[PDB]
Amino acid sequence: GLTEEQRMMIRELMDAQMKTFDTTFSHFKNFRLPGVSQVRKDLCSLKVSLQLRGEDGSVWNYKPPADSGKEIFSLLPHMADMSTYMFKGIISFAKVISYFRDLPIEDQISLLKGAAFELCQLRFNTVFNAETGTWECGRLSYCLEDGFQQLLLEPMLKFHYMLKKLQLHEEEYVLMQAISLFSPDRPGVLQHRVVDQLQEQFAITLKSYIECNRPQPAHRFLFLKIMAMLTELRSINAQHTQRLLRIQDIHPFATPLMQELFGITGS
Numbered sequence: 001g002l003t004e005e006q007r008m009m010i011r012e013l014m015d016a017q018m019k020t021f022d023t024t025f026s027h028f029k030n031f032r033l034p035g036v037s038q039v040r041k042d043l044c045s046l047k048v049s050l051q052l053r054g055e056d057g058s059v060w061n062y063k064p065p066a067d068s069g070k071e072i073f074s075l076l077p078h079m080a081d082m083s084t085y086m087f088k089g090i091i092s093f094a095k096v097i098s099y100f101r102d103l104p105i106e107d108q109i110s111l112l113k114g115a116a117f118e119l120c121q122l123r124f125n126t127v128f129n130a131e132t133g134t135w136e137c138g139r140l141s142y143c144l145e146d147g148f149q150q151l152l153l154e155p156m157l158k159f160h161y162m163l164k165k166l167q168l169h170e171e172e173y174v175l176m177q178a179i180s181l182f183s184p185d186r187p188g189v190l191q192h193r194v195v196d197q198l199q200e201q202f203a204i205t206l207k208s209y210i211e212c213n214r215p216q217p218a219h220r221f222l223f224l225k226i227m228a229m230l231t232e233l234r235s236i237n238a239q240h241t242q243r244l245l246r247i248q249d250i251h252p253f254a255t256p257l258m259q260e261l262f263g264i265t266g267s
């Protein structure tokens with residue numbers, strides 16, 4: 001069984017998640033849409049078509065082009081708007097958690113800058129349909145273009161399929177978010193020991209939750225698999241930060257919030 005402090009910790013994380021995760025994406029609006037050397041390699045990894053289902057029942061569908069000049073950039077303003085919406089939710093999530101509110105403001109900033117991408121991807125995994133290869137974001141859908149084995153070569157995509165296969169509960173997703181947010185080794189963190197102890201507590205709570213609620217042979221080593229996925233997600237984070245910085249170098253597109261989170265100064 002979980003201790004009372006562990007149950008309290010899960011309840012606080014679950015409360016934060018329900019208050020700040022717009023799972024129907026109902027408040028995502030006014031976003032941009034595509035017009036009616038190494039950077040080229042970066043942009044060709046994630047090929048998705050886009051579908052918008054109107055409230056009236058109409059459907060708009062967008063297929064992207066092939067790498068033939070600037071057409072490589074057509075989906076960037078939209079994805080920047082979606083990422084920014086997601087990041088705002090992640091910041092709200094962190095800010096309503098007491099363990100986070102109690103850290104120095106500078107460490108709050110450093111932890112969010114370290115983890116925003118990772119928590120965004122963890123939330124996106126919960127709307128991933130692995131059978132159809134689509135992220136279902138309310139009236140918006142992102143569908144992977146046509147194989148499956150070739151798609152698992154891209155580390156982000158393999159991440160989403162492998163995490164979805166673990167069939168996690170909401171509670172395990174929110175503890176993954178907590179363990180990623182409270183990483184004591186993000187650059188600029190001052191309360192290294194406080195953050196390390198918090199992270200350890202969240203990981204212990206996760207290990208115990210799995211021990212108490214998941215007896216099936218399929219869930220053996222589940223805790224260790226989850227921690228391996230978090231390590232992989234940190235590596236994916238570093239790689240995509242580099243991709244973003246290269247693209248932004250050649251073709252500015254980051255929103256103000258993305259600039260803040262990725263360290264771009266405006267000069």
Ligand SMILES: CC(C)(C)c1nc(-c2cccc(NS(=O)(=O)c3ccsc3)c2F)c(-c2ccnc(N)n2)s1
Binds near residue numbers: 047075080135
């Ligand atoms: C929502 C899904 C999971 C479908 C996506 N997720 C990213 C994604 C990938 C990497 C990073 C981010 N976030 S980020 O760094 O602020 C950013 C925003 C625009 S470039 C970088 C993402 F949202 C996508 C993306 C980004 C750019 N092009 C294309 N074709 N797909 S599709």
